[PDB]
Design a binder for this molecule. Structure first.
Ligand SMILES: [Zn+2]
Ligand SMILES: [Zn+2]
Ligand SMILES: [Zn+2]
Ligand SMILES: [Zn+2]
Length: 185
């Protein structure tokens, strides 16, 4: 059972003018659960937000909704705010504790994120595929999502550099299958 906490950040993000095109699934590269991010970031100063803030933060049993992606953008892919940026077009969710959690716990954090994404896709009328389910590294060259990639592909972008398209697709296809599973029930 998944708790969703609607507790919006202390700042107002620009309107998009349309529903999200899909979901970018990030890893937080961090050490906090969804609740811990909420506790520290829901009511915070702009100095914290200016360093980046995604729409959603998920871990086992819990998703914090920082920004309603339905009509508002977020700062998650680092490619500016133009109409072709991931920030403008895509909702962003972080799988939390991607450094601190054990493999078993992190994999459960991922499943909470897939189930939530599935719920969003139903609301926004989207079908999961390589166009609607995305990686941060497709927008700017980074090693995110580092933990998901190493567990699901065996390739570690932290130590091995940029992965090939086939490695990226192996990971996206895994995300897509699971989101599809939850949408089907
Ligand atoms: Zn629309
Ligand atoms: Zn990312
Ligand atoms: Zn610690
Ligand atoms: Zn451990």
């Amino acid at each position: 059972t998944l708790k969703v906490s609607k507790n919006h950040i202390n700042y107002t993000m620009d309107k998009r003018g349309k529903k999200p095109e899909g979901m970018v699934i990030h890893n937080d590269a961090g050490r906090s659960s969804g609740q811990q991010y909420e506790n520290s970031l829901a009511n915070a100063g702009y100095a914290r937000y200016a360093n980046g803030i995604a729409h959603y933060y998920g871990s086992e049993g819990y998703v914090w909704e920082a920004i309603d992606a339905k009509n508002q953008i977020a700062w998650h892919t680092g490619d500016g705010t133009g109409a072709n940026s991931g920030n403008f077009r895509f909702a962003g969710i972080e799988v939390c504790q991607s450094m601190s959690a054990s493999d078993a716990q992190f994999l459960k954090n991922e499943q909470a994120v897939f189930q939530f994404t599935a719920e969003k896709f139903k609301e926004w009328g989207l079908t999961p595929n390589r166009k609607t389910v995305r990686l941060h590294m497709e927008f700017v060259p980074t090693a995110c999502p580092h933990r998901s990639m190493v567990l699901h592909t065996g390739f570690n972008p932290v130590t091995q550099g940029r992965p090939s398209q086939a490695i990226m697709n192996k990971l996206k296809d895994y995300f897509i299958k699971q989101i599809k599973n939850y949408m089907d029930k």
